[PDB]
A paper describes a structure:
Human bestrophin1 (hBest1) is a Ca2+-activated Cl− channel essential for Cl− transport in retinal pigment epithelium (RPE). Although the structure of hBest1 is still unsolved, two Best1 homolog structures, one from bacteria Klebsiella pneumoniae (KpBest) and the other from chicken (cBest1), have been previously reported. Here, by electrophysiological and structural analyses, we show that the neck and aperture in hBest1 are both indispensable Ca2+-dependent gates, and their dysregulated opening by rationally designed or patient-derived mutations causes Ca2+-independent leak and elevates Ca2+-dependent channel activity.
To further investigate Y236 and W287 on hBest1, we examined two mutants of each residue, including their individual alanine substitution mutants (Y236A and W287A), Y236C (a patient-derived mutation), and W287F (a milder alteration compared to W287A), all of which showed normal overall expression and membrane trafficking in HEK293 cells after transient transfection. The Y236A, Y236C, and W287F mutants all conducted Ca2+-dependent Cl− currents significantly bigger than those from WT hBest1 under the same conditions, indicating gain-of-function phenotypes. As the cBest1 3A mutant structure shows a constantly unconstrained neck, the gain-of-function in Y236A, Y236C, and W287F is likely a result of enhanced open probability of the neck. Although the structure at the neck region was surprisingly unaltered, possibly due to the molecular packing effect in the crystal or the presence of Zn2+ in the crystallization solution which might stabilize the channel in a closed state, all three KpBest mutants displayed conformational changes on P208, Y211, and W252 (equivalent to P233, Y236, and W287 in hBest1, respectively), reaffirming the mutual influence between these three residues. Taken together, we concluded that hBest1 P233, Y236, and W287 are critical residues involved in channel gating at the neck. Importantly, F80 and F84 are stabilized in the open conformation by interactions with hydrophobic residues Y236 and W287.
Numbering used by the authors:
A (entry chain E): 25 to 289
B (entry chain A): 22 to 206, 208 to 289
C (entry chain C): 24 to 205, 209 to 288
D (entry chain B): 22 to 288
E (entry chain D): 22 to 289
Write the structure that this text describes.
Amino acid sequence: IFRLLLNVLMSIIAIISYQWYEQLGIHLTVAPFSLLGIAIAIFLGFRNSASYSRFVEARNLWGTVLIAERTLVRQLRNILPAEHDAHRRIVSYLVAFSWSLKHQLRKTDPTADLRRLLPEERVTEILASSMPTNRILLLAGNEIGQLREAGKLSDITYGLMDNKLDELAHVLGGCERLATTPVPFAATLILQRTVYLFCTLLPFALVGDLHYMTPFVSVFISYTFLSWDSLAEELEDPFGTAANDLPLNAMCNTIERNLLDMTGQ
Amino acid sequence: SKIIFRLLLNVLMSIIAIISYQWYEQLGIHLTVAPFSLLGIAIAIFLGFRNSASYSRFVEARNLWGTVLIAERTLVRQLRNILPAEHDAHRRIVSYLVAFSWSLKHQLRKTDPTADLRRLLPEERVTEILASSMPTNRILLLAGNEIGQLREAGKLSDITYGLMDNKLDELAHVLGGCERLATTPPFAATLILQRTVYLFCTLLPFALVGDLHYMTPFVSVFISYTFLSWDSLAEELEDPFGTAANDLPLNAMCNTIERNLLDMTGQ
Amino acid sequence: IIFRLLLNVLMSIIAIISYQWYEQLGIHLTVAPFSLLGIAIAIFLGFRNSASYSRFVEARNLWGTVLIAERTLVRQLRNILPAEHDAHRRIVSYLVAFSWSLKHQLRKTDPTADLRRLLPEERVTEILASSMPTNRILLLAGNEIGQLREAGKLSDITYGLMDNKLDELAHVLGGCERLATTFAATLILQRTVYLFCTLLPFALVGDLHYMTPFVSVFISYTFLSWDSLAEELEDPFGTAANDLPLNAMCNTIERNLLDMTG
Amino acid sequence: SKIIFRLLLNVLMSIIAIISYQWYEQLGIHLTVAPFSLLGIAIAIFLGFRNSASYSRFVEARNLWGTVLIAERTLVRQLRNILPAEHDAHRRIVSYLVAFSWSLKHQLRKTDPTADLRRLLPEERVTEILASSMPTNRILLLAGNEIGQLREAGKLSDITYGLMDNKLDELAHVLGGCERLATTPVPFAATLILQRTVYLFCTLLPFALVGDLHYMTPFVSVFISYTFLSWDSLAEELEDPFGTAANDLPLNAMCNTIERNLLDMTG
Amino acid sequence: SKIIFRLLLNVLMSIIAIISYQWYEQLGIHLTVAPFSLLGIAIAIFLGFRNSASYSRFVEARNLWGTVLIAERTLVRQLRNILPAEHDAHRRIVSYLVAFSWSLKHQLRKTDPTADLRRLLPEERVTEILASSMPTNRILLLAGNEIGQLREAGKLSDITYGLMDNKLDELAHVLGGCERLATTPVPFAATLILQRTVYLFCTLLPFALVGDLHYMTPFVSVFISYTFLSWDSLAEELEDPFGTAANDLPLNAMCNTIERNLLDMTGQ
Ligand SMILES: [Zn+2]
Ligand SMILES: [Zn+2]
Ligand SMILES: [Zn+2]
Ligand SMILES: [Zn+2]
Ligand SMILES: [Zn+2]
Ligand SMILES: [Zn+2]
Ligand SMILES: [Zn+2]
Ligand SMILES: [Zn+2]
Ligand SMILES: [Zn+2]
Ligand SMILES: [Zn+2]
Ligand SMILES: [Zn+2]
Ligand SMILES: [Zn+2]
């Protein structure tokens, strides 16, 4: 990539610069730039650790959707094995919540998936709100509440599936917070500029003791910094459509297929 | 910030170090780079662990504000799933939940909550809330009376009361976590680490000038920037409930919460 | 592995040889630049290994929860329905089937024999037909206590106490499927650590001469031993040395539940 | 903060090293700085990790005291929300909950809790609590009896009794967790060898620097020693979180805050 | 202290090193500090991460045993508060709860729980516990039957049965956790690598140091090696938390504390 190509030529410039720039006293020893490189590597490791934690919290939150939606459908079959109208409808809302969450995080438009799973009557209320995924939850709770006032659910077994709508609410909230949070941007931008300036200004610090071999031993260590710095660029925002990013769309079909299998479809 | 000035000190110090260089060899004073390499590496390790503790303190603060929104969403949702017809209780409870959020904001920011309280609640409750050592505690007490009176009237069983009571429990744990991060910021985690990061940076050009005849200023400023950049980020993370640009945007988060709760109750 | 150590011992020897021309060709491969590169690689190896250990530790805990949850579900059936041993043995068979199925699911092998050894062939087909057979097994564990509730021998309360244990086992199922399915981070380190070990003696040749190959191999031992432990801790459901003994764990589970039903 | 002592000893070792350096090489005794940077960086790594473990102990202690306030605040809230008219019982339980906080504090500080018990509770139960060898735990059971008597009198249902029983379980986890944190010198050697090891490195450091610095040895040596000593000292401070240092837990503040909260919270 | 073998051996290596370095100049062998610093710094980072794992695992073991004391305290509290008249049931459930602690100590120490079981329970129930291949787990089942018998006799409702049942769940995560920790060491590879790499590094160190320290090599090579060995040893003093060594957990003392707590709450 560009960065190391720039470094190899910049390394080339440093060799020519050293010889033809001898008159000015540009003595640049290796010891100071070693203290600097060790320092910013300590910071990159700590930063990349913080980014990686953010990525697996995202991955955990989505793991909880599949768990929570499997157990509420199983509770539904176990507690009310006859009410397939309630099961068809509730599975619709559970599946739509997943796709709505996915389109929300991807800042893309959920209408194709929501008509596919819901009557456009309801699909009109959901998109009329600024919080469409939250209202899908509130509607799924309404189906469960209906069963309670009909005397089909007691308060006890109502509460046990109420607790699964709680697990899903914490997913909704946490995902929004992860999307919304901008704390990583300040640290990383200072590190990114610092990492870059350090690599390009580095052959001028090696050329005194390395001569021609400067390009080789400079393009190498530039690779190991840019690569490890770029790694945090991938985990900082994990809801991206990138192959590196969570396969959010594979995960929603798994959700839909599984909730379809459990409902005798 | 204070980082631009401390950068300018370092430059001046490099110039002082070059002139100090002529007197340095006869003076019998030699400052090699190797002892400062060791000191600089140890300082970087300590700042690494420190920033990590500051970032976690910051992450938890926004996590705690994350579940105000979550707990209040589901409490409003339970109210409508269990008592779909009690819109009076829906509205009073929502006004308490909205008041809890704004008063929590005022509590962490050490500012006056009466205006926000007077917009959302009747005046006799505002006096009740402000007489309390913990006004946001008193608000959870009042919301609890709403669900508690619905229970007395027989419109809530003990089961469905407990379900909503749990959400007021979650709000209390949010309340105590925020109070805890405010009253528990360690001193030497910034006493040492800014005095020594400061003193290390001003002393560095002197240790560097023997090896770099005129480049002492440039490389010394690069090193000082990265130590001061990394060090000050931890104090931009040290007051997550503060009011700087990198602190939590708690006003916007209170508007988000209230707009969320109003949207759920048809307003 | 050992091939790589032997190659470093050679590659040191090529540096041994190629040193005769360092002066005439103009080479100054000095040590301090490689001393900085190795220290940074160690920092990233330490962090990557620590993240690899966490996935392994979390995988270990998920499987611990299977044994804990299935134990106390069986405790509850005995404490609450002590004379219902037709139901005890049916539910226990699904629980044992659950843990073997998850082993096969994470290992990508055939559960049919295990399912047949433990369940009637009628339900072995229902399980072998679902998208997630482990998921179906829990569904069928839930109809057993579900029916006891409409048999009226479980109240909604005591039903829910055992329902909670099935929620616990679903969290394990999702936890494992998330770790089994969840490149650069390694790919960066996998490529970089190797190239540093082959180039190091050429920069070491300069002061170690003949004792170049053994410090070069000593250093490379420390680095490669650490990097490969991360790759096997990364795949905790694999078959490597320090991978989870899943077969032993399912047997422990089985002879635990076959100890609590009479 | 006896850092000043081994700072002033460090200056001494520096001047012996200076005057005795010339004498010192009488047969080939030589101390370079490179072995002392390998050793010093290693010691720095182990200090960061140790300090990170000590900080975690501090954060857990604060979290445990946090939920004392949270659990006690919601327990008395549930009492007023569920039984608004039974204030004879609110006063009895509030004083047990307040006595639990103070009794917990005296137990961790190894101080006499009699004055705070005789001020909150009737003397017949004060002697029952002092007779027991686990007094804080006996306060919990006593608070539990109050809830239990309200349940045998039909004023509480099993469900509503259950919601409050939960909060007593929260306090039971606090007590045990606090007791485990107090009794954990465990491997005190981990900081005990490190305290000495850091001490020997800082005494020997000027002898390893005089060849490079000469007269500037005591300045660079005290700076390196200060950095290492203070970070070590912060750790020995953090890992005794119930101690009496300033960086420790304001236990007094929290006990008074919850008493005021509970009092202001009922009249 | 397998440490003085490696520490004292370091002194012998240092003397062999001085004579050896003048010969090394003649031979073609030559050792510098800087390569070993790269080694030593790499080892210390790895030593630091391993020891953090070893420490976390020791902390989890101490946590789990603390839960035994917490959960049995509240189980006893609930019983008195909910069934204050039921002293016979109080005493029976307390003995199982005490028996579980001791039986968990014995099993983690692979020692014989028979004498303790017979001091606390009727022999007819000691036989049942010892017949099982998982005795401590069976102690939980018997305690659950005491609670369950109270539920069927109508003295406990399903609600208050469940409040107590949740506490036996707490004890079941302790038992699982301890069994897991008792069988899952911090990887053999981790400690093996670090055992041999610190060893080899400690013996070959005085060689690389001899050119810089002349006659001072042993007084510094033993100081450096001592740091790396004491820090690798601490991971081997946190590996065996259920053993009987001084820095292991005082499980016997922790078990006595639990017993006298529960007798304190039941008058006995
Ligand atoms: Zn769940
Ligand atoms: Zn159906
Ligand atoms: Zn919640
Ligand atoms: Zn309404
Ligand atoms: Zn010059
Ligand atoms: Zn459990
Ligand atoms: Zn049976
Ligand atoms: Zn000498
Ligand atoms: Zn709580
Ligand atoms: Zn009152
Ligand atoms: Zn508990
Ligand atoms: Zn009794």
